Design a binder for these strands. Structure first.
Lengths: 686, 705, 249
RNA sequence: AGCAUAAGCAGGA
RNA sequence: UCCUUGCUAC
């Protein structure tokens, strides 16, 4: 035992302290003897000295210590008197000389080690080099030596003669690139080599001794020959055919609310009566529901009696000034209660012979055709409505003499166009109605509430609110981001219905309304639908649709001055045309140019439609129409573009067009773009 | 009258009317239900792209192993994508690569890489995305799964003293040599596990459905690895990161606009009297099913041929962990009767026993994956899924773009993760057919399959790279995400200035013209006011927070010095997006208002902008009623111990607290150290020093017992 | 007398049974991975749950003994400000926040607030004293650079700053002593003539030191001169299709 | 019924 | 075997 060999001449406390320092360093055994010799020698330096001194003695022993605290006490002394170390730690702290003291012990010549540490730090600190053989080459200043030196070379002769009597010379050495070579990993790495190799060693030697050859080009041309791939030009084989719009049943109206066929009742807005149930009550006295008699036989639809009893139940519910539907069969049938499958886990199944034969089957989505009603709602949606401001915007900040005026001017002018249109009425409808539905879906799960469908706008300066319908929640327990709770919508309209457009509705009749320019009809619509958590989060913040639109407009304006280097902004928004809206009987070079400012109207429309009809089909169709826009830009400058495989391309574009009315509409207008661009450029068909 | 919104493009470019074609104002499509069929499509599509049947039996794993390199069965349908790599061809491309720039290239980049590995601490593994915890077999953040891993280490055998990268990796390999591993299940029981099951569990990668990806019709399965693959992949991403930073034909770190100007301008000055240039935008298809890690093992065996002995075996372990990965197959499917009334749930475990209750596509995809299925997982050995090596495949792309065949017709370009731009220089059009088919030849041999549907070209610069459509002179910007303007949602003080920070960073990086900036500033202001129910004082809003403001408005003298959260107007602008609202408005506040708001003796804040509205909303209610209550007790204990370590070291959140001994012994030795330093120049009292010494010794005897 | 309190807290926390298996079993660095135990996934909808938070009546956790010293249980017309449901922390409404902001006590602390944020008030002071001019409407654009963006007068490189705060704030566990100290140690004497006696907490003090010494150098598209004063004037001066600069001084 | 689109929600403890 | 309840202001 090396410990018992040590304890014949090593001290007793140095076992615990020096062994503790070896436990601080790691798992070694010769460092016990190394810290024993160095620390015990430093104890021999501080053994009998300091006869009379200050409160603290002349020698301070902090080299052999818990390896956190020589730096801290070094900062207490060097911060007390004022000193600074030089990226090095000292062995014994001296205060009589106001310097440090560092001791090295070697077996070699005392010249080279002092050239090592003196090559490191120079004449900054004090270095003393000792040797078991009896060599001594150290720094030029000295002290009270030839007392401590006699005993320390006596001790090095003592332990040196012990090592001569025990033959331990290569074990007495003072002071990374090994990975832990495990067993299952080397059996795993040799198993996952490529097939012409046996072990990782042969692969490593062949990768370390690799030179290339000219059999590379023979395999390359041998890959060229068995290819059968030709490129397809456009100036000779311009097969950019129009897309395949499905010739089937027309796509219905799928928006949750009514845009073009809406009818609102008005009253002046009260500031004290501002909660949505109070707006519901004040429109129960304002819009007289006593004249809202409905026959139990609808014009068309699916379910007549349940909507009649549901409308009567919610009408007497609003009549008693409380919004909570008491449980009857109508609400238990319409908003889904108990209409869920029994989710049985696979712990009990109790199998029966040829009874409850169960499996699974999926179908997909059905295909529809080109909608004919979408053009009249596009041209209706960008037409100015006299009710003025709809969108609740905010105040304009003050401006310096910077470019801010320009920005402010643009914003003011663009806002002066967009507050009056009917798209602002639909955005206000979605914000107020879906926001109120959102707060009701948070505050009351498990209870069916009644949320009005309304707006707010300024009529002749008087701030008024509208009322477009009555919405009914479906006890939304929104656990996840999905959930698809059931909203029952009763809508107000003043036009004759259409079984092609209003296909999902359950149109009743409502009554008569006096309309001054005589007294026309009134049609109440019914529809059951569903919403989710995410579409509540996205529909209630549609005001961000104003964000990209101006950007597009501003790019045009900036590019104009980017071609001209002159402040032409106000007159450039007046004396510039923008092509839109070709006619129906003819298309070829018969386009309607409008002013550049009014164009922003049309732009906000399509941004709002991107808020509504977003599906997978619109995403993939937008990628592929970016491809065809790149082809048309390649046509515009006569660059002679080319394609490698058109057939699978049209199988992906004609794959990603199923049932979205915006996707079918923009596909049709893309084909008409190919006709109008076909009137000038030659890469297309008719 | 019809109408067409695309007609503006008849006299414009694709650099102005291209932000019109993005549906970024709507909701992204999400996934519903199980994600099993997508993983079956990925793995079974990989085995369909294996182009072989050469199977090799295994001694470690109980399942067969198919090879993916140098075993080709050449089908006639070569335009279909292949997944077979020729290693001598790609090593010839690497030798062709290093002969272009310098001589000691890989030695230099490998010495910088290993120079940064040896000075790296392992707590960097906690600064990442979500990982897979195999202890409870769920998805967790990086610090929780790392601390459960270290918990299994210190619970199984011994303690942990590493505090480095390399000793932690060697600790993981030492866990591979262990015969039995014990961890904690749930109410905290202690369970055990064998040796081969620990190998089956340490190499499990969890797949799920990619939610919110703008631009696809069908969904896709993303994969998340565990914890024992992350530091090795960090090593490989540092190596390939330095390699990509040194090269001149890559665009992952980023400038991506100067490089294309220098290569279009530099290669248009290398034309002869009859030569010309044609650029081709392409799109590499099936990028996650044709990158095998065995070619990564050969190339990473070639890069570090003269680096060290540590790096040579340390950069050759993560591809060996990618050749034998498992795949979680989701959570099963659901069966129902003819009446659609009772719907049983079949998990991923019993899918083999209930095989005969599936569809036609489910049995077609299921019988081509059957001889590779484990109980819960699958054995894929040639795939490189999402959330993996991304800076290393780009180096393969630069190797495909630096091919030299020996006329004077050649190519150059730029490479990304899966988007390349190729510039060809030649003399005639059938020679263009020869050069392009040679590019499809070298990419087809190496394992990169160009899509024939999404590729095109023109003669001048009209190409496409990372959704920036470059025209002949002008540059369009990236159509950025809209909801990122309002995603702070924490405070009445750190929302509007955070929104001005997002508007500022989108103004400097992207174009973001000033009218859009003022408009988005005003809309974010309006969503702030609609969020926190605070309106200006001159408005007619009468709620429970404007009644107090409208009642007490007479006390305020200077009315436009109020904050926006207290019913003030707007004073920030485009030229004030770097100054917060409070610091801009403190030159105009009333002294009663300013001394009343900014009082640190407030019941809301007590227990980067000024903290005077900073409140904390209340916690949830179902966090203490489920079976995971005791884990919230454990984070309470962790916050208590971290509060004690904050109570010992007065400056600990500034510097990273390195050290490898213990926490409590540094506490006790620190209280003794400051007890001596504050003793001799300070305290001086026997009852205080003896009482603190008595409590330290009693706490030490209590802690040791 | 703080070490007696720390002894009572350390002896109080070693009294627990299963807490002794936590400390003296990990490492010093594990404190970092003891800091983060966020069992929530990502908090993927912060503004959504924030609007769901503000729609209720008592969303806020507020202290009891500070608010009951001056506050009132209910306002003059039905406005609730208090609850009795639950540590002794009581739920409350933001009407009590604005009621504190208009009908509460006040403590004069303008010197401390105008001394912590010297960099940001320096930004406003440099912003108010500049002059602009006309626009240009010209093509402009250049590459991306690494630019120091703050007009500091010390210009350290994020390595003498952490070491500097170790050798200024708390030197008992600061760092191994380097060669970067010397002239900066004279600067340590100048900083120890400043941060000795203040009411500012050490985290806020280490925060406010790092904003007068650190030129924030970022990778931004720059054009024209590369002066560090006009780098908050980067996004205000020019974009891609326009430019406005007439700064005289 | 409906939302929805290759699979889920339409309560649960 | 059973159905607890949150209070909404553009």
């Amino acid at each position: 035992v090396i410990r018992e060999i040590a304890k014949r001449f090593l001290e007793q406390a140095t076992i615990n302290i020096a062994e503790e320092v070896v436990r601080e360093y790691g798992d070694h055994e010769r460092t016990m003897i190394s810290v024993g010799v160095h620390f015990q020698a430093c104890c021999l330096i501080s053994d009998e000295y300091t006869l009379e001194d200050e409160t603290t003695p002349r020698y301070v022993l902090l080299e052999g210590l818990k390896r956190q605290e020589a730096i801290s006490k070094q900062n207490n002394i060097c911060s007390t008197l004022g000193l600074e170390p030089l990226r090095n730690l000292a062995d014994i702290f001296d205060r009589k000389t106001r310097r440090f003291l560092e001791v090295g012990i070697t077996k070699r010549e005392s010249d080279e080690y002092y050239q090592e540490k003196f090559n490191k730090i120079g004449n900054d600190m004090d270095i003393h080099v000792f040797t078991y053989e009896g060599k001594y080459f150290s720094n030029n200043p000295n002290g009270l030596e030839d007392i401590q030196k006699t005993r320390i070379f006596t001790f090095l002769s003592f332990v040196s003669d012990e090592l001569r009597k025990e033959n331990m010379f290569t074990e007495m050495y003072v002071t990374e690139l090994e990975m832990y070579k495990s067993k299952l990993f080397i059996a795993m790495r040799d198993e996952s080599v490529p097939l012409p190799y046996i072990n990782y060693e042969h692969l490593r030697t062949r990768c370390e001794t690799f030179k290339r050859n000219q059999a590379e080009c023979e395999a390359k041309v041998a890959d060229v020959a068995s290819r059968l791939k030709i490129k397809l030009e456009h100036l000779e084989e311009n097969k950019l055919r129009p897309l395949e719009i499905p010739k089937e049943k027309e796509a219905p109206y799928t928006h949750k609310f009514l845009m073009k066929d809406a009818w609102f009742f008005a009253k002046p807005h009260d500031s004290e009566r501002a909660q949505p149930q109070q707006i519901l009550y004040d429109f129960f006295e304002a819009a007289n529901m006593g004249f809202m008699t409905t026959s139990p036989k609808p014009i068309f639809g699916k379910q007549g009696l349940m909507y009649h009893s549901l409308w009567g139940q919610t009408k007497r519910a609003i009549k008693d000034k409380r919004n909570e539907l008491e449980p009857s069969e109508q609400r238990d049938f319409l908003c889904g209660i108990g209409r869920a499958s029994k989710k049985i886990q696979e712990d009990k199944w109790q199998e029966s012979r040829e009874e409850e034969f169960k499996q699974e089957e999926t179908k997909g989505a059905a295909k529809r055709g080109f909608p004919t009603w979408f053009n009249e709602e596009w041209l209706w949606a960008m037409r100015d409505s006299k009710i003025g401001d709809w969108i609740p915007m905010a105040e304009m900040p003050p401006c310096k003499n910077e470019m801010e005026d320009y920005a402010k001017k643009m914003c003011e002018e663009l806002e002066s166009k967009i507050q009056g249109t009917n798209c602002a009425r639909e955005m206000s409808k979605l914000i107020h109605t879906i926001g109120s539905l959102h707060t009701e879906c948070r505050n009351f799960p498990g209870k069916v509430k009644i949320v009005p469908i309304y707006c707010r706008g300024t009529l002749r300066g008087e701030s008024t609110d509208c009322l477009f319908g009555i919405a009914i929640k479906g006890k939304s327990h929104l656990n996840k981001d999905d959930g698809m709770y059931t909203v029952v919508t009763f809508e107000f309209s003043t036009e004759e219905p259409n079984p092609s457009k209003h296909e999902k509705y359950t149109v009743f009749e409502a009554g008569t309304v006096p309309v001054e320019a005589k007294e026309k009809k009134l049609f109440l619509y019914c529809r059951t639908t569903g919403m989710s958590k995410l579409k509540n989060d996205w529909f209630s913040k549609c005001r961000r649709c104003l964000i990209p639109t101006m950007e597009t407009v501003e790019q045009i304006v900036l590019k104009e001055c980017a071609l001209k280097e002159e402040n032409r902004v106000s007159e450039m928004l007046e004396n510039k045309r923008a092509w839109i809206a070709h006619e129906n009987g003819e298309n070829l070079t018969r386009l309607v140019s409008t002013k550049l400012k009014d164009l922003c109207r049309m732009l906000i429309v399509t941004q709002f439609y991107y808020c509504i009809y977003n599906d997978n089909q619109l995403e993939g169709f937008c990628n592929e129409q970016k491809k065809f826009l790149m082809f048309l830009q390649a046509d515009k400058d006569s660059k002679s573009a080319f394609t490698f495989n058109q057939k699978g391309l049209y199988e992906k574009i004609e794959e990603c067009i199923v049932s979205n009315p915006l996707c079918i509409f923009l596909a049709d207008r893309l084909n008409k773009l190919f006709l109008v661009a076909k009137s000038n450029g030659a890469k297309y068909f008719e | 009258m019809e109408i067409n919104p695309y007609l503006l493009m008849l006299n414009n470019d694709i650099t102005s009317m291209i932000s019109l074609t993005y549906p970024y104002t709507g909701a992204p499509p999400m996934s519903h239900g199980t994600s099993t069929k997508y993983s079956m499509e990925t793995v079974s599509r990989t085995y369909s792209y294996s182009r072989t049947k050469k199977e090799v039996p295994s001694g470690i794993f109980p399942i067969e192993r198919r090879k993916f390199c140098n075993t080709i069965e050449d089908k006639e349908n070569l335009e279909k994508p292949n997944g077979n790599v020729d290693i001598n061809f790609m090593l010839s491309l690497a030798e062709m690569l290093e002969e272009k720039m310098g001589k000691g290239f890989f030695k230099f980049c490998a010495n910088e890489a290993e120079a940064e590995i040896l000075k790296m601490h392992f707590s960097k593994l906690t600064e990442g995305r979500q990982t897979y915890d195999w202890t409870s077999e769920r998805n967790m953040p990086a610090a929780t799964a790392l601390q459960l891993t270290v918990d299994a280490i210190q619970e199984t055998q011994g303690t942990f003293k590493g505090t480095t990268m390399v000793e932690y990796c060697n600790k993981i390999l030492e866990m591979m040599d262990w015969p039995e591993v014990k961890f904690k299940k749930v109410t905290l029981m202690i369970t055990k596990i064998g040796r081969e099951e620990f190998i089956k569990r340490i190499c499990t990668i969890n797949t799920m459905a990619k939610d919110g990806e703008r631009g696809k019709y069908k969904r896709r399965a993303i994969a998340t690895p565990g914890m024992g693959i992350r530091p090795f992949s960090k090593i490989v991403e540092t190596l390939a990161q330095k390699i990509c930073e040194r090269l001149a034909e890559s665009g992952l770190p980023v400038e991506k606009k100067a490089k294309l100007k220098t290569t279009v301008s530099s290669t248009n000055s290398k034309l002869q009297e009859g030569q010309f240039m044609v650029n081709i935008t392409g799109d590499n298809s099936k990028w996650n099913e044709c990158q095998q890690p065995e070619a990564y093992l050969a190339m990473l065996a070639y890069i570090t041929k003269d680096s060290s002995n540590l790096m040579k075996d340390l950069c050759s372990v993560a591809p060996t962990l990618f050749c034998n990965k498992y795949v979680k197959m989701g959570q099963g499917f659901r069966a129902k009767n003819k009446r659609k009334t009772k719907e049983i749930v079949i998990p991923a475990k019993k899918m083999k026993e209930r095989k005969e209750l599936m569809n036609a596509e489910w049995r077609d995809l299921f019988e081509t994956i059957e001889p590779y299925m484990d109980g819960e997982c699958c054995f894929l050995g040639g795939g490189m899924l999402m959330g993996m090596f991304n800076m290393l495949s780009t180096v393969f792309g630069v190797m495909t773009l630096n091919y030299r065949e020996e006329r004077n017709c050649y190519w150059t370009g730029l490479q990304s993760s899966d988007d390349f731009v190729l510039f060809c220089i030649s003399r005639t059009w059938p020679e263009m057919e020869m050069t392009i088919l040679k590019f499809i030849a070298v990419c087809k041999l190496m394992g990169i399959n160009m899509s024939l549907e999404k590729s095109y070209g023109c003669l001048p610069e009209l190409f496409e790279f990372t959704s920036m459509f470059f025209s002949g002179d002008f540059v369009s910007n990236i159509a950025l995400e809209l909801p990122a303007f309002t995603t702070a949602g924490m405070n009445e003080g750190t929302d509007f200035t955070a929104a001005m920070s997002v508007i500022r960073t989108n103004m400097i990086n992207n174009g973001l013209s000033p009218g859009t900036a003022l408009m988005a500033l005003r809309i974010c202001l309006q969503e702030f006011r609609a969020t926190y129910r605070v309106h200006p004082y001159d408005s007619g809003v009468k709620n429970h927070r404007m009644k107090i403001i409208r009642k007490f408005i007479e006390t305020i003298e200077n009315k436009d010095g109020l904050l926006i959260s207290d019913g003030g107007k707007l004073m920030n602008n485009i030229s004030s997006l770097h100054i917060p609202e409070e610091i801009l408005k403190e030159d105009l506040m009333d002294p009663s208002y300013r001394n009343r708001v900014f009082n640190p003796r407030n019941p809301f804040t007590q227990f980067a902008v000024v903290s005077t509205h900073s409140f904390r909303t209340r916690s949830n209610r179902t966090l203490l009623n489920t079976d995971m209550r005791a884990m919230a007790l454990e984070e309470k204990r962790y916050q208590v111990v971290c509060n004690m370590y904050r109570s010992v070291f007065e400056s600990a959140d500034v510097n990273t607290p390195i050290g490898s001994m213990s926490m409590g012994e540094a506490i006790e030795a620190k209280i003794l150290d400051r007890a001596r330093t504050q003793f001799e120049n300070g305290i001086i009292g026997g009852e205080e020093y003896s009482e603190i010494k008595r409590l330290i010794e009693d706490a030490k005897r209590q802690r040791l017992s | 007398s703080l070490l007696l309190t720390l002894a009572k807290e350390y002896a109080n926390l070693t009294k627990d049974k299963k807490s002794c298996k936590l400390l003296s079993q990990g490492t010093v660095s594990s404190y970092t991975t003891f800091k983060k135990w966020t069992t929530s996934r990502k908090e993927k909808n912060p503004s959504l749950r924030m609007r769901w938070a503000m729609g209720s009546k008592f969303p806020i956790m507020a202290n009891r003994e500070i608010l009951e010293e001056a506050g009132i249980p209910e306002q003059w017309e039905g406005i609730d400000l208090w609850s009795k449901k639950d540590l002794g922390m009581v739920l409350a409404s933001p009407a009590a926040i604005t009621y504190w902001n208009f009908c509460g006590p006040g403590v004069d602390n303008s010197s401390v607030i105008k001394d912590v944020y010297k960099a940001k008030f320096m930004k406003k002071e440099r912003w108010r004293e500049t002059l602009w001019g006309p626009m240009n409407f010209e093509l402009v654009g250049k590459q991306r650079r690494v630019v120091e963006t703050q007009p500091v007068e010390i210009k350290l490189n994020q390595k003498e700053i952490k070491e500097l705060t170790m050798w200024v704030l708390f030197e008992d566990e600061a760092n191994l002593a380097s060669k970067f100290i010397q002239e900066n140690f004279s600067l340590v004497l100048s900083l120890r003539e400043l941060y000795k006696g203040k009411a500012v907490n050490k985290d806020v003090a280490a925060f406010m030191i790092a904003h007068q010494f650190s030129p924030e150098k970022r990778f931004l598209p720059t054009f024209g001169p590369i002066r560090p004063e006009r780098m908050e004037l980067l996004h205000c001066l020019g974009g891609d299709f326009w430019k406005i600069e007439a700064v005289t001084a």
